[PDB]
Structure 1
Amino acid sequence: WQARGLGTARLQLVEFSAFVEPPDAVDSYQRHLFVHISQHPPLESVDVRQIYDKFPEKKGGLRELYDRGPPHAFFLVKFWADLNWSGGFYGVSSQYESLEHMTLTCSSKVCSFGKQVVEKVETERAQLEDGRFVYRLLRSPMCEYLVNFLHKLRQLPERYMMNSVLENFTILQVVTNRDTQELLLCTAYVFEVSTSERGAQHHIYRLVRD
């Protein structure tokens, strides 16, 4: 009964991307993906206690949320970001899918050294498509801390210096039913840089606890 991708039975992540389009994409289109999960054998498990220290610890960080439950909704995603590509569009697209009509509240907490730095909260409503309800947070503008972070991260004269910086940089991402405050999906993101000739890639774990 364990999860096999990023989703419960109540809410599945269809696709998520963070991308940049260069200014000349209006002439011939071109999209560079920093990170990408597409979802059109169990997932491995990571103890949630090992990554507690990387996330905030008062209200709406990991200890309270996991003790809130439900335990099966909690995932860790490890990203190898692609960091080779000035004034283009920096974007996040998310799609979710579900069997209910809900209203989704998506929080994205960005944490540096395990304390929250910026947070964006978005509301999306179900639109019914083909017997299933679809939630489309498409082409959301990436918030300006992270765009500035990416340019300065790219500058770094070593690739292992980027991984040192990204070690203390995490994103926590909580999706709730707006009406009823049920947690549907909590995903913790930890970050490495990819090499240039490799693309972006990801590994998805379930978060489990004793």
Structure 2
Amino acid sequence: ARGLGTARLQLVEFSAFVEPPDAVDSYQRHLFVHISQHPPLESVDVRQIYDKFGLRELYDRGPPHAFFLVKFWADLNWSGGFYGVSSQYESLEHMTLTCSSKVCSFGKQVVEKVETERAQLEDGRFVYRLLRSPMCEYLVNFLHKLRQLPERYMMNSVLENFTILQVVTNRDTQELLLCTAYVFEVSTSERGAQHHIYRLVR
């Protein structure tokens, strides 16, 4: 694969953002993370991130190529605005998707989010839109609380135990389509949000 996504279901865009209250007057938005997919990928052993998450249960269930690892270098420099998460997938089949998002701190599932979104025909492609979903209030507080840590390495220390498991399944057939594991560091002030996309093997 050359990017995040199987060839049965591919991730177009994924972003967690904030819009300040004066975005109505003049629109700006700040990206905590961002993936835009609109050279093959490097390999990471899934046995090496088992402790951070069920990943082993899902991986043995398969298929292996559906599993990806993304690390974010989040932008945490930017209160009371809207906090949003947007996801967008594309496929050549017409499916109904179930997208579970399990957020674990220290391996303990803190928040889980399950969503359903059915296909839409758009220019020879089937587009799945989960745009502008409000962020969990826990995650807004955690992002807030992480923001005034006095040191960058303390932020990285806390984020060492903070993981997100993305599970996208065909709702009708119950089969797994895409699985992404998110591991977090914090980017510097001068750099924006960044990602690297690995592929989980073995």
Instruction: State if a TM-score over 0.5 links the two structures.
Output: yes
Deviation at 1:125, TM superposition (A): 0.3
Aligned residue for 1:195?
A: 188
Q: Any idea what the Cα deviations from partners look like across 1:150-208, whole Å, max 9, x if unmatched? A: 00000111111000000000000000000011100000000000000001100000000
Deviation at 1:145, TM superposition (A): 0.8
Within 1, Cα distance between the matches of 2:107 and 2:69?
15
Deviation at 1:114, TM superposition (A): 1.0
Within 1, Cα distance between the matches of 2:26 and 2:79?
17
Deviation at 1:115, TM superposition (A): 1.6
Within 1, Cα distance between the matches of 2:167 and 2:79?
31
The two structures have a TM-score, normalised by structure 1, of: 0.95
1:158 matched to 2:156: no
Structure 2 stretches lacking a partner, 5+ long: none
Deviation at 1:121, TM superposition (A): 0.4
Q: Which runs of 4+ in 1 moved over 4 A?
A: none
Q: Any idea what the Cα deviations from partners look like across 1:56-94, whole Å, max 9, x if unmatched? A: xxxxx1011000100000000000000001110000011
Q: Any idea what the Cα deviations from partners look like across 1:105-140, whole Å, max 9, x if unmatched? A: 000000001121110000000011111110000000
Q: Any idea what the Cα deviations from partners look like across 1:12-46, whole Å, max 9, x if unmatched? A: 00010000000000000000000000001210000
Aligned residue for 1:146?
A: 139
Within 2, Cα distance between the matches of 1:50 and 1:115?
18
Aligned residue for 1:58?
A: none
Q: Secondary structure at the match of 1:28?
A: coil
Q: How many residues of Structure 1 are paired with residues of Structure 2 in the alignment?
A: 202
RMSD: 0.5
Within 1, Cα distance between the matches of 2:187 and 2:123?
37
Q: Secondary structure at the match of 2:153?
A: helix
The two structures have a TM-score, normalised by structure 2, of: 0.99
Within 2, Cα distance between the matches of 1:131 and 1:35?
29
Aligned residue for 1:21?
A: 19
Within 2, Cα distance between the matches of 1:177 and 1:5?
20
Identity within the alignment, %: 100
Within 1, Cα distance between the matches of 2:81 and 2:110?
24
Structure 1 stretches lacking a partner, 5+ long: 56-60
Q: Secondary structure at the match of 1:9?
A: coil
Deviation at 1:4, TM superposition (A): 1.0
